[PDB]
Amino acid sequence: PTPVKPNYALKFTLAGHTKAVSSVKFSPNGEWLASSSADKLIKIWGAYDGKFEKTISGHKLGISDVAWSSDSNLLVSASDDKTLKIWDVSSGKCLKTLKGHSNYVFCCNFNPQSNLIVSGSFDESVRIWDVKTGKCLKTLPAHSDPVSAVHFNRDGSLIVSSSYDGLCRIWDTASGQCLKTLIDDDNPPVSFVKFSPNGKYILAATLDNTLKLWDYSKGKCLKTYTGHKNEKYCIFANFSVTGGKWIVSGSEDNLVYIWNLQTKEIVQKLQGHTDVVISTACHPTENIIASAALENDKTIKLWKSDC
């Protein structure tokens, strides 16, 4: 049963957004895909049949990122309007507007407990917010250039952030202190970071066509994934764990790349988008990928593999 390669095949193309898509994310309960776009809208789609479910509106400018709560009932979105918004998915209503960043909000996530939201912004700060009250609990002077990604680890006790300043930092959620600064070589911009599913590693993209897997604690690079194009955009990357253990990323050559996590060999390339694939997401229980593309494409594609 150990796989050798996936066989992702296109099942659905989801059109509706009227500007570039920025981020796609599967709900933790597997039922839904949420997408955000430069068109200022969130759209919710059925994860299994591509069925359009609803549009969620209210931001005054484009959205760069969206993230789900652990129970699949809330979304948080990060917008160029300098705010985040917390949304009730069932109703589509804005429950809270998280005000405090002084420039575009670029990235966001809930902690696993989903009592906190973390955000990163072009204002070069990382902010930690109380879900219940909408209060900003902490502002971290995390970076000296825009923050490209923020992510909680599996127990919520750590946050990893990345920035165009070239750093990846690991923060103690409770205290706000930097536990560790991952710095490497001439330090190109770090355009994306997230924790591995088990919390021991950090997957980081740099704007030199490189993904790297790092043991944060040991400060050592374990794996490097190359062969794609990423020199401009903050492209999401994923750990695929439902079948074969893959790394997934979009690319500026309009393809989805899939690598063997262990061997670093490319195991599949998905063709079909007609612009930069800015975002990919991996379904939490099924071998399903979502991909989304920029202005000349504006579609979301759903792909299925047997492994």
Partner: peptide, 7 residues
């Protein structure tokens, strides 16, 4: 419209 990520 625009988003910083899609620009």
């Amino acid at each position: 419209s625009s988003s910083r990520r899609s620009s």
